[PDB]
Amino acid sequence: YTYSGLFCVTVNPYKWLPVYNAEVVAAYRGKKRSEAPPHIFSISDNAYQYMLTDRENQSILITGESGAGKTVNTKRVIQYFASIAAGTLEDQIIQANPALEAFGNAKTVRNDNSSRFGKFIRIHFGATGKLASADIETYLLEKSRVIFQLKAERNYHIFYQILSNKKPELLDMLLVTNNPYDYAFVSQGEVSVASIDDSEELLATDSAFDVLSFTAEEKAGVYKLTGAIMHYGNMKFKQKQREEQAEPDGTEDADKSAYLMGLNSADLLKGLCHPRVKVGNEYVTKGQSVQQVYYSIGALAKSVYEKMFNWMVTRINATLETKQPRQYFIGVLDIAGFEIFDFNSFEQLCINFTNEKLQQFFNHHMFVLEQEEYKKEGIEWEFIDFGMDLQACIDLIEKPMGIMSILEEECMFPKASDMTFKAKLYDNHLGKSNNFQKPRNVKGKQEAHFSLVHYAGTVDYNIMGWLEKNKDPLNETVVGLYQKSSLKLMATLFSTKSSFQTVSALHRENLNKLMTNLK
Amino acid sequence: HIAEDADRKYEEVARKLVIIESDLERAEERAELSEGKCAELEEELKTVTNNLKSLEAQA
Amino acid sequence: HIAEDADRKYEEVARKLVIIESDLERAEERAELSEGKCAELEEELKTVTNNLKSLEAQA
Amino acid sequence: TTALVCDNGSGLVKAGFAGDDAPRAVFPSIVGRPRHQGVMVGMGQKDSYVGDEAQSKRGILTLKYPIEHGIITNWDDMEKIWHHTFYNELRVAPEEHPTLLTEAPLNPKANREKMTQIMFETFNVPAMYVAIQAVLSLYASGRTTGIVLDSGDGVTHNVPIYEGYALPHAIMRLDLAGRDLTDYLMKILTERGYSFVTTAEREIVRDIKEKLCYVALDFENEMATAASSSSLEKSYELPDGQVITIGNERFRCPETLFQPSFIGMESAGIHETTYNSIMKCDIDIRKDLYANNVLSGGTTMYPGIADRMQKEITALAPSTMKIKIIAPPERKYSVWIGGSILASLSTFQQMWISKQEYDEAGPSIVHRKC
Numbered sequence A: 001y002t003y004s005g006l007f008c009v010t011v012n013p014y015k016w017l018p019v020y021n022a023e024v025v026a027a028y029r030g031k032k033r034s035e036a037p038p039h040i041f042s043i044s045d046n047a048y049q050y051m052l053t054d055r056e057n058q059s060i061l062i063t064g065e066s067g068a069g070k071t072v073n074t075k076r077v078i079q080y081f082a083s084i085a086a087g088t089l090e091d092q093i094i095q096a097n098p099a100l101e102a103f104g105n106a107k108t109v110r111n112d113n114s115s116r117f118g119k120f121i122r123i124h125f126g127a128t129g130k131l132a133s134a135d136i137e138t139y140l141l142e143k144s145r146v147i148f149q150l151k152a153e154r155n156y157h158i159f160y161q162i163l164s165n166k167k168p169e170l171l172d173m174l175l176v177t178n179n180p181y182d183y184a185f186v187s188q189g190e191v192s193v194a195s196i197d198d199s200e201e202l203l204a205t206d207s208a209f210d211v212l213s214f215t216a217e218e219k220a221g222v223y224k225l226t227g228a229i230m231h232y233g234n235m236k237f238k239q240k241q242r243e244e245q246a247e248p249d250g251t252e253d254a255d256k257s258a259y260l261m262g263l264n265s266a267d268l269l270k271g272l273c274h275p276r277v278k279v280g281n282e283y284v285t286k287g288q289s290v291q292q293v294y295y296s297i298g299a300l301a302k303s304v305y306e307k308m309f310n311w312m313v314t315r316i317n318a319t320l321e322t323k324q325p326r327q328y329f330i331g332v333l334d335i336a337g338f339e340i341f342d343f344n345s346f347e348q349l350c351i352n353f354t355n356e357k358l359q360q361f362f363n364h365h366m367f368v369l370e371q372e373e374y375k376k377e378g379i380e381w382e383f384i385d386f387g388m389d390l391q392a393c394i395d396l397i398e399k400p401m402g403i404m405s406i407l408e409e410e411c412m413f414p415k416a417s418d419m420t421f422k423a424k425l426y427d428n429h430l431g432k433s434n435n436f437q438k439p440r441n442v443k444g445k446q447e448a449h450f451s452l453v454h455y456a457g458t459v460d461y462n463i464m465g466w467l468e469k470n471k472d473p474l475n476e477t478v479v480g481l482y483q484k485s486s487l488k489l490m491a492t493l494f495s496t497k498s499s500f501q502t503v504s505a506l507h508r509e510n511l512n513k514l515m516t517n518l519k
Numbered sequence B, C: 001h002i003a004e005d006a007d008r009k010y011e012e013v014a015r016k017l018v019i020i021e022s023d024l025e026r027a028e029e030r031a032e033l034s035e036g037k038c039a040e041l042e043e044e045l046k047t048v049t050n051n052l053k054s055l056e057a058q059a
Numbered sequence D: 001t002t003a004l005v006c007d008n009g010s011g012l013v014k015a016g017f018a019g020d021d022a023p024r025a026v027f028p029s030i031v032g033r034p035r036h037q038g039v040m041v042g043m044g045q046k047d048s049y050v051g052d053e054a055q056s057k058r059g060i061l062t063l064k065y066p067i068e069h070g071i072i073t074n075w076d077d078m079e080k081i082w083h084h085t086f087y088n089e090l091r092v093a094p095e096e097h098p099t100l101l102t103e104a105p106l107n108p109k110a111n112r113e114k115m116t117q118i119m120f121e122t123f124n125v126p127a128m129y130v131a132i133q134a135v136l137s138l139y140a141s142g143r144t145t146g147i148v149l150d151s152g153d154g155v156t157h158n159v160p161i162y163e164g165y166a167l168p169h170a171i172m173r174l175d176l177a178g179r180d181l182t183d184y185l186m187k188i189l190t191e192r193g194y195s196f197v198t199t200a201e202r203e204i205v206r207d208i209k210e211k212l213c214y215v216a217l218d219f220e221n222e223m224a225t226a227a228s229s230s231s232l233e234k235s236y237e238l239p240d241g242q243v244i245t246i247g248n249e250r251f252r253c254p255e256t257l258f259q260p261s262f263i264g265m266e267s268a269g270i271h272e273t274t275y276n277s278i279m280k281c282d283i284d285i286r287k288d289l290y291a292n293n294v295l296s297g298g299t300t301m302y303p304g305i306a307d308r309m310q311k312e313i314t315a316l317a318p319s320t321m322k323i324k325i326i327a328p329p330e331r332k333y334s335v336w337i338g339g340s341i342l343a344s345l346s347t348f349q350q351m352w353i354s355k356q357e358y359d360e361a362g363p364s365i366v367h368r369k370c
């Protein structure tokens, strides 16, 4: 254990220690952080004191991309909170956690179980300080993973868990084989990692579905959704002969998907091949090139997966909720950390921007606390805000002329290529920014295309393929198809005087939402 | 008077309905036959396009 | 009683008449759409066949 | 802050917000004034009706289009139409939105000067901009190269683009469009007995044109076929019963686009002016122009117009080029779609004409710079 100014640096010991148990050490009750030995339980007690003495919500931000130490630390702190403000809520949390483990985790090139989303546990307290039920909140998800995967990686486990050929009832209900190389949305990188078995994962997930209030339909339907997303991966279309219009060739996968989701094959095919718009008070069809329809298919799969995920989140939050009216809570913000790999890509840019925002947030916090302390001792000393200004210049990415802005601009721009994108970037930022610099590509490494100076060093990125990552033209016709499907889970998902949606936009807005949640 | 008037004119309405239904069935036959013939025609066109592109490559 | 019963049966039959007319016009517009396109691509086939023949002469 | 896109046109106003997929408001560009006495005291009679309110009351009104051939010839009526578009159709405040207006190429400069002066003074837009309809149509087609043929209600024009460079010396503008076809059809229907003389009757004939007319692939044998059998005759029902049946008028009306001598014009058909605009371009880009003819506007919506166009241009061009007529299914709103795309670009936000620039330079800035 270690104190660092305002942080709390702890190291995983790999060794059982009674430094946590029994309460003989958990006697920190009433103390401050400065006087006791530097234990995180003292931090949790300080959080208790603060939330009780100011009636203000508190926040816990741990770095999480470390494989272990995240798990045990979360467990021990939530156990501490269970103890202080006293089949427990911790049991309840770790019961259905396989849901999140199987949906929001996949093998990363430098990991084997990585949370690709943010976990923000809200553990609630009574008006006087007795623990209440706890509702967890999830946030932005790396949903581009649904379609595209780099080499030596793979998307979310649940696909491979199912594909483990464990329960043939599923693989037959979904009319699906066991070869992963036949379904493209998962077979881009590696089909399996030998560091884990998938049968035990499927069984853990089945147990999680059972302990949850899921019925036969609330399990087989999710399996159907995943199977249909996988059968999307090999939908094939051709230009109509002599003209510019996508035409289908083979409808086997279309039959599978129409049967699965409770849809029509012809209706699906035409609504994909003939989008329609509400023009004033009228309806007119739109023509489509093949690539546009493929964009539509990918966006459909992404939205299906995302809303299914969110609905399971709400289901779990309900299943762990039964309690009298409450007021106050403590925020437990788990989040991925910074990434510096040997081949950085767009998703890494997103994650680095998220971490940039969080770090500037922390810097603002420490800045204001230090300024307070300096006002306290009558110590006259003023300075440029350490919290915002030094980093406000490295968020060019958010200014609607910066990197991601120009990215969407090109996404809408016709015939836009990665070379044209690089040209526009260099026009707008080369030399006019100090943080924007040209990468040093020395033969022996993969080529980068630009370099930014973050707080975590100077990062280099390779812009190849980013238009495919950011474009999300949603097809409202198939949305209407979904909103009527016989598969009741589909309708429950999509119950509630379009062609422009970008992953960058939604990512940025969810980030700002979480920032407002914190501030 | 009004009842028998409505009776007669709306039986004639049903007669026009017989006419329109007959012509609708005829138009369904026309549509299906035409789309089948024109699927045959599109087979001819795709085949002759293959022919022309192959043969012009050779040329 | 007779009069109102007649009127209601009649109005239902007529409100089926109107949808039959709509489906009739839809069928005939689809058939003429088809046939017109089919003769236009028939002319296209004639052109490509003439090119096929000229190309045979070239071969 | 979002921006407004207000493709005006001479027959239909299409407005909406930059960033949508289709215009939010589409109504006729028409102003109606009461024609008759008015006897019901207390009815609250208005002075004038605009948009499609003037269309449902058209039985008692005399309708006037404030735009004749792409040129705005009545500025009070145009002000009424803009006021309606902003306040009753879109329900916004023009003081909080840049506005992207649109204009046909090669029309008087006073048109744009008055447009920008009207906007900045009687609406207080923060900024505005006047695009060219063909460029926006090309934006919406997802291309950077092609000869676009726009044909709305007032004017038909070709603009050839290459790699994003316009060839302003090859722009060809023609003044027969939807409205002249409507008038020709009003004149041709009299030889069967039907007489439409009122402006409301002109609207009726416009609807007949939009529903029953098509372009014949071969005009002469189509004429002979209509003479021989009677399978080409359809029927239309006026809004008082009284069905009418038309025969060869169906394809004699839009044929005027290919033989403008039917209405006593000396110009050439649209196929021939397209070919001439191409042959006025540098010999290196015309092979790529031949394969990117982009059709746009309402008057290009007749059935069979793309096939006839391709047949004619193929007969004109050398026998080695690949003529491709690109006719999207939503080509009637291509100008608005492209306008929204353009007004949404990040690199465009410096092209607006801010209020301050106008205050410095007068209304003459619109073409002097932008």
Ligand SMILES: Nc1ncnc2c1ncn2[C@@H]1O[C@H](COP(=O)(O)OP(=O)(O)O)[C@@H](O)[C@H]1O
Residues within 6 Å of the ligand: D008, D009, D010, D011, D012, D013, D151, D152, D153, D154, D178, D179, D182, D206, D209, D210, D211, D297, D298, D299, D300, D301, D302, D332
């Ligand atoms: N389906 C159709 N078939 C033939 N002509 C049409 C059709 N729809 C509209 N038009 C013609 O297009 C004109 C309106 O086209 P539009 O592009 O809106 O004009 P503008 O661009 O000047 O507003 C009308 O005059 C009408 O005659």
